[PDB]
Amino acid sequence: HSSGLVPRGSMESGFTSKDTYLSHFNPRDYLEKYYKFGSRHSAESQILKHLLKNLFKIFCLDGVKGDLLIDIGSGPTIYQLLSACESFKEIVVTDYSDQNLQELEKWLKAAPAAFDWSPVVTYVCDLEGNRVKGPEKEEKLRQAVKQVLKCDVTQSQPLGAVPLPPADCVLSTLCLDAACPDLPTYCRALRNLGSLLKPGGFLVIMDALKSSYYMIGEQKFSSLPLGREAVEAAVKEAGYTIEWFEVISQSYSSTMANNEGLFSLVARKL
């Protein structure tokens, strides 16, 4: 093993192996290290609020809406879907790592051991005008999530053999940097994801810029350090057109990730 020197599961290829996401990725540690939302003025909270505001604007003031939205690399998180469940009749959340989708499956049952998204749900409700309070928002979301599937962005069929109608949208937060060891792997995954999108559908990606790693405590995972133009071009060569592309300076703390901001885009398959 490497021991901090380089990302775990990467001494050989240079990039954390996907089997490492089944070995050493503890979703409950991840949730508490990035989504506690306990103090709102952590570096983690400021980033999350921006993610939530972008999702709110994309899904509640912009057009993006429809019948099916497929979220890619959900991990064990549900925040990226709270504003989205207002505009899509059905949401299918996916992930590669069985540990993350069970920690997810615990949350749709509202099982007591589950992680508490209570305050995060609350912050999205006030954004959306306080039509509802938390518990109903969570219950609106829980009925919308209609499937929990094993997923792999590196495959010709990312979702394997599971049949689904073409999605009205595909979303992916903090995954592709984590899932793709290089630019050709990165570009291939965005074409694999287009495999699930109707023509003229929406691709919504938010990720980290020039980030070579992120931490969950002391276990270090690899991240593809991409710049805006690398991402801008990678998406363009996957067969999409970018309707909006935004970049913010705000970064994770040096202890958790060495990103230089995050990016946020809306694209459409040509």
Ligand X SMILES: NC(=O)c1cccc(C#CCN(CC[C@@H](N)C(=O)O)C[C@H]2O[C@H](n3cnc4c(N)ncnc43)[C@@H](O)[C@H]2O)c1
Q: Which residues are annotated as a binding site for S-adenosyl-L-methionine?
A: 30, 35, 73-74, 79, 95, 100, 152-153
- Give the pairing type, strands 197-208 and 167-173: parallel
Does 264 sit near ligand X (CB under 6 A)? no
Question: In 128-166, which residue ranges form alpha helices assigned H by DSSP?
Answer: 134-144
Does 18 sit near ligand X (CB under 6 A)? yes
- Give the pairing type, strands 167-173 and 213-216: unpaired
Instruction: Say how far apart CA 19 and CA 29 lie, in whole Å.
Output: 18
Residue whose Cβ sits closest to ligand X: 75
Least separation in angstroms between residue 131's CB and ligand X is: 25
Does 97 sit near ligand X (CB under 6 A)? yes
Choose which of 17, 42, 122, 154 interacts with ligand X (CB under 6 A): 154
Question: In the chain, which residue ranges form alpha helices assigned H by DSSP?
Answer: 19-23, 27-34, 43-60, 98-108, 118-127, 134-144, 176-179, 183-194, 228-238
Q: Which is nearer to ligand X, 133 or 146 (CB)?
A: 146
* Strand (E) or helix (H) holding 268: strand 262-269
Place of tokens 């691709």: 203
Choose which of 55, 58, 169, 175 interacts with ligand X (CB under 6 A): 175
State the distance between the two ends of the chain, measured CA to CA, in whole angstroms.
44
- Size of site (CB under 6 A) for ligand X: 28
Contacts of ligand X in 116-145 (CB under 6 A): none
Is residue 25 a contact partner of residue 17, using CB atoms and an 8 Å limit?
Answer: no
Does 9 sit near ligand X (CB under 6 A)? no
The residue ranges that bind ligand X (CB under 6 A) are 18, 21, 73-75, 77, 95-97, 100, 151-154, 173-175, 177-179, 208, 211, 213-214, 223, 252, 257, 259
